């Protein structure tokens, strides 16, 4: 890939974040947050390590703007916010791990996705419940009710985007 193709890819990833990080799952009007799939897909495909911290930086300034200027609720922003970072890293590591084996991969992909997203969900949903300070008496039961509610739609968002990456790749492979 030329420098130009790299810049193009870079901008399309930042733009995707820009356009989707205000929706955790799909609505009639809007695309859901591509962020979790992106970090996973960076794990799968992109060797350069520096891209991950760069794309984290982008996510953070995007959230700040969305809320400061874009009129988006700041409900979700709290001391627990930084727990996004280990979730992003877990997803990236997930994609690295999936690429290591099977260097056919599909039923293996599903199992890897479910596990790696579950780690991200614990860190984020669990981080928020336990450390946002918006919950006076957080319990294990309470944690699990919330994982049960949020995991399916956020997993579906992830599978939407990773699904498409897969079908793009298999296509391009033929081509
Ligand atoms: C709603 C929401 C939003 C809304 C804004 C808030 C709002 N509109 O109230 C939107 C979509 C705008 C939003 C945006 C963001 N969000 Co938000 N958001 C959520 C969500 C889905 C719920 C908030 C919540 O927990 N409220 C607290 C109460 C109301 O809900 P609860 O604790 O679960 O309890 C109630 C429900 O379970 C309800 N209930 C029980 N059963 C049932 C059944 C039904 C049918 C219903 C409807 C309700 C219901 O009753 C309970 C009352 O005790 C959570 C999901 C999650 N927790 O994983 C993320 C979450 C809080 N958001 C998060 C983040 C980070 C963001 C962003 C800052 C960036 C991002 N995309 O990651 C952006 C904003 C910046 C930007 N735009 O660029 C993270 C926080 C991560 C962390 N702290 O480490 C979370 C935890 C998502 C995640 N798993 O990553 N978000
Ligand atoms: C939003 C704008 C996007 C900017 C993208 C252009 C810069 C690309 C840098 O190249 C990357 O540098 C790695 C460093 O380790 C190398 O391994 C490898 O050459 C490549 O992956
Ligand atoms: C959302 C992240 C998107 C990044 C896509 C650009 C990186 C290009 C990937 O190059 C190589 O391509 C082969 C087939 O495409 C892969 O098998 C290989 O593992 C990968 O390293
Ligand atoms: C701010 C985020 C920037 C993200 C931009 C990612 C650019 C893609 C990385 O470069 C390319 O990666 C392929 C797989 O590693 C290599 O096949 C190719 O030779 C290399 O040039
Ligand atoms: C059930 C999921 C558990 C997640 C593991 C908790 C990590 C350590 C707890 O410290 C947390 O560290 C974050 C950054 O270091 C801060 O954002 C947060 O305020 C702080 O309390
Ligand atoms: C039966 C398997 C063992 C469950 C693990 C023990 C922790 C407490 C369980 O939390 C509860 O789990 C229910 C399903 O088990 C959910 O429907 C409910 O919303 C949730 O709050």
UniProtKB/TrEMBL annotation:
Keywords: Membrane, Transmembrane, Transmembrane helix. This is Cobalamin ABC transporter. Cob(II)alamin binds at residues 21-22, 24, 33, 76, 80, 124-125, 146, 149-150. The chain crosses the membrane at residues 3-22, 34-67, 79-98, 107-131, 151-175. It comes from Thiobacillus denitrificans (strain ATCC 25259 / T1).
């Amino acid at each position: 890939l030329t420098r130009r193709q790299q810049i193009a890819i870079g901008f399309v990833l930042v733009l995707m974040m820009l356009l989707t990080r205000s929706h955790h799952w799909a609505s009639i009007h809007s695309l859901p947050d591509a962020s979790w799939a992106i970090f996973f897909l960076l794990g799968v495909y992109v060797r350069a390590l520096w891209v991950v911290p760069a794309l984290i930086a982008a996510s953070v300034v995007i959230d700040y703007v969305a809320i400061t200027w874009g009129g988006v609720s700041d409900f979700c922003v709290s001391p627990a916010y930084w727990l996004l970072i280990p979730a992003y890293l877990a997803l990236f590591a997930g994609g690295r791990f999936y690429a290591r084996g099977h260097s056919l991969g599909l039923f293996r992909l599903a199992g890897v996705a479910l596990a790696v997203v579950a780690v991200a969900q614990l860190l984020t949903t669990g981080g928020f419940y336990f450390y946002s300070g918006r919950f006076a008496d957080p319990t294990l039961a309470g944690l699990v009710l919330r994982l049960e509610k949020y995991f399916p739609p956020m997993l579906g968002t992830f599978a939407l985007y990773v699904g498409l990456a897969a079908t793009v790749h298999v296509a391009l492979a033929a081509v």
